[PDB]
Amino acid sequence: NPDPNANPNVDPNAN
Amino acid sequence: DIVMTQSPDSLAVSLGERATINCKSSQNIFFSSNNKNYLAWYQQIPGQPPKLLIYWASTRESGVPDRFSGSGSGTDFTLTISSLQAEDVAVYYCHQYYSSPLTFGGGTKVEIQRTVAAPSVFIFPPSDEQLKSGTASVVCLLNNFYPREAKVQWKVDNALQSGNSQESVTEQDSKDSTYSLSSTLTLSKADYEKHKVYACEVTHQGLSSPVTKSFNR
Amino acid sequence: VQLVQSGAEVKKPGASVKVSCKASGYTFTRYAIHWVRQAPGQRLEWMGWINAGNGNTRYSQKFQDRVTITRDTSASTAYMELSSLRSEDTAVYYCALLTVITPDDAFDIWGQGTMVTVSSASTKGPSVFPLAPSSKSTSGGTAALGCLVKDYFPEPVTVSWNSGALTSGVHTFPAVLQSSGLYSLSSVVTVPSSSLGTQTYICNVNHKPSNTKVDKKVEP
Q: What's the CATH number of domain B120-216, 1.25.40.10, 3.40.718.10, 2.60.40.10, 1.20.1280.170?
C-alpha cells in the first residue's frame, strides 16, 4: 500500500 | 526503492507527429482502495525547474494543453503527446509518490525532426575593451542550423589552429527547432598581434562546400 | 505562489553549504517543502521534506548522515544544510512544493534552483565584453551582436537583453570551462541591420556569487 507520508502534500482521498 | 525506468531515452519526430514515452515502475503503484496510481509526469526545459504536467497518472494539471495525456495503471505507464509542437522540445520525467524515498525516472528527451537549414555564419574580432586587458577572444557564431552536426575550424594567417578554441551548442530552439553554435578562439594579446588574417571555416550538411568568414586584425 | 532560493555558492570539499528557500503567495505553515537536486546531466534526486508547520522531517537514506532541513515560519523560509561535501555533490539544489494535491486545489511549484559547486577553485565575477555588430557580423539584412561573458566562477550567470524587452532570436550558449579554471560564454542576438542606428542593445549580466549586475551597451 502507499505510504501517505512519502509526500505530505498529497491528499489520497482527493480525486 | 521504486526504480522508474523510462523508454526510449531520446525521441525525435516531426512537427505534429505523435510522441510516446513509456515509464515502468519496479513495483506496483496502484492502490485498489481509491483506484489511484501515484505517478506524475514532469516537463523540463534547459535552465528551468521541472513543470508538472500530469498527476494521478492521467489528470492534467490546469493550463496544460490537452495534447498531453497520461495512461496506464500498476507498473506500466505512458505519456502521449498527440501532436508534437515546437515548444514541446524538453526532457520528460516520470515520478512516483507511492513510497519513500520519492523517485524520478531517468528522463526522455524529445526533439523535433525538421528540414535541413544551413548555418548563418558571423565572426567577431576581439573588442578594444578586452584587448586592453591583455587577452584576445575571436568568436565565430553559427546561427540557426539543422541538423546539429557541424564542424568549425580556425585558421590564423592561413594555418590551421589546434588546441586554442572551444565550442558550445544550444538546445533545440523552441520556435524554429534549429541549433546554434559558438566557437571561440583564445590567444594572448601578444600572439594575436603577431598575425593578420583570422578565419573560421564552417562545414555543415546544408553547405555544398565549407564557408569561411574572415577578417584582418 | 513562489519559492525564491539563495544564490549559487562554491564550497571546498569537506566544507558545508546552506541554501535558503523563501516562500511567498501562501500561508507558509500549510505545506511541506521538499529538497531535490539535479547533477549536470543526471536525473532528479529527492533529498527530504520538512513540514513547514510542525517542523517534522523525512530524509532520504543517501543524505541522512549529512543533511539537515529546517524552517523559520516567521521568515517563511526553509533551509537545507549539506555537510562533508564531495565533488559528487556539485549540482543544482531545488526547493519545491511537490505535488500539492488537496480537495479543491492541485499545484506544484519549484524554486529557481541554487547551483552549489564543490571546488577549491577561485571565485570571480565575469568580464563582459561587447560583440559589436560590424560588416563581419551581417547575414544579409540581419546583424548579429552579443556579449562575451568571460572568466567567471562558479556557474551560473544569467543574461537578458534590454532588461527583458528583447527575447526573439537570443541565444545564450552553455558555459565552457577554460584551462584557467574559469568559465566563459557568449550571448548573441540577431536584429534587423537597417535599425542599428536607432535602437539600443544592452546585455544584462548577473552573477550571483559575485553580486555582478553589469549592463553593457553593445554599439556598432
A: 2.60.40.10
